[PDB]
Amino acid sequence: AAKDVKFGNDARVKMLRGVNVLADAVKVTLGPKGRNVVLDKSFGAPTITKDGVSVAREIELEDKFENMGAQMVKEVASKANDAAGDGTTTATVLAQAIITEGLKAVAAGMNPMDLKRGIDKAVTAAVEELKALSVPCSDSKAIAQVGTISANSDETVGKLIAEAMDKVGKEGVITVEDGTGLQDELDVVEGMQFDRGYLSPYFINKPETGAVELESPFILLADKKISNIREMLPVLEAVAKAGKPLLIIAEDVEGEALATLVVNTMRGIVKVAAVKAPGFGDRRKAMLQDIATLTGGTVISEEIGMELEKATLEDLGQAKRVVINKDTTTIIDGVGEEAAIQGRVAQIRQQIEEATSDYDREKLQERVAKLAGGVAVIKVGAATEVEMKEKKARVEDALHATRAAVEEGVVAGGGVALIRVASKLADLRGQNEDQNVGIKVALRAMEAPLRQIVLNCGEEPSVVANTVKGGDGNYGYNAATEEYGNMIDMGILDPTKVTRSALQYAASVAGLMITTECMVTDLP
Amino acid sequence: AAKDVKFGNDARVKMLRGVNVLADAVKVTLGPKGRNVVLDKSFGAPTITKDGVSVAREIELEDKFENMGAQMVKEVASKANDAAGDGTTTATVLAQAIITEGLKAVAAGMNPMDLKRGIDKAVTAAVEELKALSVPCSDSKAIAQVGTISANSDETVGKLIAEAMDKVGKEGVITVEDGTGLQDELDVVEGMQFDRGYLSPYFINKPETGAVELESPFILLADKKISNIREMLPVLEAVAKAGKPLLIIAEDVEGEALATLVVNTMRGIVKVAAVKAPGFGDRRKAMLQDIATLTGGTVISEEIGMELEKATLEDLGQAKRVVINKDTTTIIDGVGEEAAIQGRVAQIRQQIEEATSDYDREKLQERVAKLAGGVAVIKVGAATEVEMKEKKARVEDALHATRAAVEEGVVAGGGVALIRVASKLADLRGQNEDQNVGIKVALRAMEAPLRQIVLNCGEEPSVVANTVKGGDGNYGYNAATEEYGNMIDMGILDPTKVTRSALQYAASVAGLMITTECMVTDLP
Amino acid sequence: AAKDVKFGNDARVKMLRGVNVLADAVKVTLGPKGRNVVLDKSFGAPTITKDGVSVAREIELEDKFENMGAQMVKEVASKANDAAGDGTTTATVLAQAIITEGLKAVAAGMNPMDLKRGIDKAVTAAVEELKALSVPCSDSKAIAQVGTISANSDETVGKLIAEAMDKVGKEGVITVEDGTGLQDELDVVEGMQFDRGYLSPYFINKPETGAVELESPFILLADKKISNIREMLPVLEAVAKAGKPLLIIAEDVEGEALATLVVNTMRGIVKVAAVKAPGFGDRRKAMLQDIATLTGGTVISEEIGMELEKATLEDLGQAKRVVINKDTTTIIDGVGEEAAIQGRVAQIRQQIEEATSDYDREKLQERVAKLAGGVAVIKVGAATEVEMKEKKARVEDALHATRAAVEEGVVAGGGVALIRVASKLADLRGQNEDQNVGIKVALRAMEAPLRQIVLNCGEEPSVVANTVKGGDGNYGYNAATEEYGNMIDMGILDPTKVTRSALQYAASVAGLMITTECMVTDLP
Question: Total domain count for chain A?
Answer without folding.
Answer: 3
